[PDB]
Structures are given as C-alpha cells and as structure tokens.
Amino acid sequence: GSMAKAAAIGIDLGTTYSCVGVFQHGKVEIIANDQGNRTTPSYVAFTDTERLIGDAAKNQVALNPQNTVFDAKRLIGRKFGDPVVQSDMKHWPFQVINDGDKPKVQVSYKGETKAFYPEEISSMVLTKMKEIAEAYLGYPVTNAVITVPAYFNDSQRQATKDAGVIAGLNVLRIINEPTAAAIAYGLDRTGKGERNVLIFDLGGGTFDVSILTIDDGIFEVKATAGDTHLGGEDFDNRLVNHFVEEFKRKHKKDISQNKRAVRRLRTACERAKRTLSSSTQASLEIDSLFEGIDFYTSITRARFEELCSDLFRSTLEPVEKALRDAKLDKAQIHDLVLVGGSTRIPKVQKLLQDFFNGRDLNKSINPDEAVAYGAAVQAAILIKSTRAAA
Ligand SMILES: Nc1ncnc2c1nc(Br)n2[C@@H]1O[C@H](CO)[C@@H](O)[C@H]1O
Ligand SMILES: [Mg+2]
C-alpha cells in the first residue's frame, strides 16, 4: 500500500556548534556523533589529502589555522563590503576574498588554491549533520527543518536554504532559532490566549534576546536585542589573563608569547569554566606549560564570578532594551527560556532570575540542544499527510 516514511530531522546550524535531533515515539532524540558528542563544531578543514568536518576539523586547528574554516554563518548571505564582514575578517586566520562583492573563503586543498562561498562551507557542515542522523536511524534522510537567527534577512534565509540543497537535503522550512526554542518547551501548545516569551541566548561569541508573542500557536517576533561583543569566549579570555598574571607572580615568567602555552592555558581555562558551573572550585593542571615548569593551580567559582562580573551584568542591558521595544513590563513575560551552553553559568542564571523577581527559568532541555529539539518537533509536524475521516 504505502511504504513507511523516513523520519525528518531538525538541524540547529550554529555559528560555532551545530546540533541534530529527530522526533520519534512521541519524543525528541538529540543525536550524538561518532565521537559521542551531542553537538558538532561548525568547522571544515582542508589538507593535501582530506576534507575534515566537525570534531576532526576543530581538533587540528592549532597547526592548520589558514585552512580550517569556522564562523561561515557570519558571512552567509552578506556582501563583501558589509561593515560587519570587514571587521570580522581581522580576527580570522583564513583568507576571505572578494568575488563580485560576495565573500568567499580561500584555502589550500588537495594541491590547489580553492575558494568557497559561505553556503558551500555550511553545506559541508549540513552533510555531516545528515550523516550523524543516518548513522543513528540506519537509513537515508531527505527532509529537514533548518533554523536561523530571527534577525536574518531574505538573502541570509535563501543562502541557508541553498546550503541545505547543496547538501542533498529537502529543506521543509527555515524557522527562527527563538521560535524553535519555544516549540521545544511546547509553548505553542498551551491553547487560546496570548503568551509573551523571552528567549535568552548566550553563545560562544554573541548574545541575543528575543521577545515572542504566541496566540493560538501563531508566533510573532515582538523585539530582538543583543550584544555582538559578548559570549563564552570573553569569559575564557578573562581566565587566560588571570592565569598569565598568576604565572608571572609565582614563577617571574611571562608566557604570553609562546602560542602553544597560551593555547594549552585557554583549553584548560574553558574546561575549568565548565567545571565551575557544577562545582564551587576547579583545579587547573598543565605539565611543562613554559620552560619545563608544571602549572598546578586552582580557581574558585567566586573568583571566576568576580573576573567576569561586568560581562555577566551587561546581559541585562539588551533584556531591558528588548522589553522597551516590545512595550512590555518584566511582570508581563509569561515564560523565560535559556539557549546556549554559557547559560549553565549559575551567576548568569541568578542575575536573570533576580531581574524577573525570582521567576523560574526553563532550562530542563539542555540549552545547547533546545533549538535543534524544537526544529525536530516541527520537522515531524511538517511531513504529516493525514486525510480527514468522514
Ligand atoms: N557547562 C557549561 N558552563 C559554562 N559554559 C559552558 C558550558 N557548556 C558549554 Br557548551 N559552555 C560554553 O558555551 C559556549 C558555546 O559556544 C562555549 O563558550 C562553551 O565554553
Ligand atoms: Mg545557537
């Protein structure tokens, strides 16, 4: 009669990390990749012999910075002359070239100089997410919902669809990331009446606040605000500067000019930062950090909180701005939703909860997974083809 249909997938195509989910048996499964990771770096690396995508690309970035591409989402659907593009290029080790006022990333690959459009790099990330899903399902996947930031314009949305088409995916729909996070919590399934939802999204490099109104499952974006210069990497930077100073005090040596030592220090700092989200202290143990000196130290959560205190408080400025733009008072917000790994920081949670006078935060769905979760819920709804009974 009719053959069983393959599951459709939900993909959060993120700036730094991507995530894939599938809705089956009345629930969402966030799919881990073959290294056991529930999120995959949005990285693509090129060598004389291979093209590596995800963890394999990110794990070799230190010695191949010119040919390892990341942050393609910051270039997608933008003109080469866009001031955002020109400023971002100063921070990237890879080359960005101008092809008819459209940016392309230029690398050494398989013995040649090759240039790729941002949508081509994103299609490579999407191919890896499709393969992760097919490894779990055990059959080929065709249909997907892909998410984008609410502020993405028509060109940025079309270039994201183009990336999906290059990857061999049928793009069911491009949906906003804050809408997908709300769908993950079933905030569109609460019946008749208006609900005001605030999505608090703190990423690796940027911070976004969105206010949505939901009425009978219909979403309206009421306000967006944020800080392009606020993310998890800024907290890592504060720990880096702290430990560089500590090494100077303790050993009378400045390590800041040995890239390897700084890199090993930053890697340890990011892991210590994660431990501090569940523990009140964390150890830092690096063997032969600089001049054969072992660096064995610790940091309390209180000291880390003091180091990043101004940065954490600054997340409340875009919240107040979004509320003024939406013409709403904080008491009028019905639901608060957390998105991004950096939202696990207890102090960030406490500051926002205190701002909303003790209100509970929706954080039960892993914040680095909530967007893919909602995209998977939507993908299953979009492929339904029920014929009404008499
Ligand atoms: N448990 C956690 N506590 C604090 N931060 C975290 C945690 N987990 C993740 Br993931 N992060 C940070 O989220 C960002 C995602 O791009 C990176 O800066 C990660 O370091
Ligand atoms: Mg995100």
**Calpha distance 347→334 (Å, rounded):** 22
- How far apart CA 82 and CA 285 sit, in angstroms, is 43
Please give the Cα distance from 125 to 19 (Å, whole number). 10
Cα(232) to centroid(ligand 1), Å: 6
The per-residue b/e assignment along 257-294, b for 16 or more CB within 10 angstroms, e otherwise, is eeeebbebbbebbbebbeebbeeeebebebeebbeebe
Distance CA 34, CA 17 (A): 16
306 is known as an active-site residue: no
Question: CATH topology for 231-314?
Answer: Actin; Chain A, domain 4 (3.90.640)
Per the annotation, the verdict on 201 as an active-site residue is yes
Amino acid present at 119: E
End-to-end CA distance of the chain, in Å?
A: 21
Burial of 305 (0-12, 13-18, 19+ CB in 10 A): middle
- Quick one: tokens of 16? 């730094």
Tell me, which fold does domain 70-124 have in CATH?
A: Defensin A-like (3.30.30)
Residue ranges, comma separated, of all CATH 3.90.640.10 domains in the chain are 231-314
- C-alpha torsion angle, residues 114, 119, 124, 126 (rounded to 10): 180
Ligand 1 pocket, residue 10 CB under 6 Å? no
Please tell me if the CB atom of residue 341 comes closer than 6 angstroms to any atom of ligand 1.
Answer: yes
- Which of 74, 50, 45, 48 has the alpha carbon at shortest distance from 62? 45
Catalytic residue among 55, 88, 120, 177: 177
Q: Which amino acid belongs to residue 349? A: Q
Ligand 1 atom with minimal separation from the 204 CA: 16
- CB-ligand 1 contact for 277 (6 Å cutoff): yes
Q: List the determination method.
A: X-ray
Q: Which CATH class is domain 1-69+125-189+363-383?
A: alpha beta
**What tokens were used for 375?**
């995209």
Q: How many CB atoms lie within 10 A of CB 48?
A: 10
> Could you give the residue range(s) of every CATH 3.30.30.30 domain in the chain?
70-124
Nearest one of 106, 169, 141 to 31, comparing CA atoms:
141
371 Cα: distance to centroid of ligand 2 (angstroms): 7
Per-residue buried b or exposed e for 90-112, using 16+ beta carbons within 10 Å of the residue's own CB: eebebbbeeeeebbbbbbebeee
Closest CA to 53 of 88, 21, 78, 18: 18
CATH node for 190-230+315-362:
3.30.420.40
| Among 53, 57, 97, 54, CA closest to 75 | 97
Query: How is residue 191 written in tokens?
Result: 């019946």
Ligand 1 lined by 374 (C-beta under 6 Å) = no
CA dihedral of residues 103, 105, 110, 112 (deg, nearest 10): 60
- Give me the residues paired with residue 173 across strands: 145
Cα of 15 vs its chain's centroid, Å = 5
CA-derived radius of gyration, the chain: 22
Q: How far apart are CA 363 and CA 35, in angstroms?
A: 25
| Partners of 194 in beta bridges | 215
Ligand 1 pocket, mutate which of 58, 269, 273 (most atoms under 8 A from CB): 273
Residues of the chain with CATH 3.30.420.40: 1-69+125-189+363-383, 190-230+315-362
Q: Which amino acid is at 55?
A: D
12 noted as active-site residue: yes
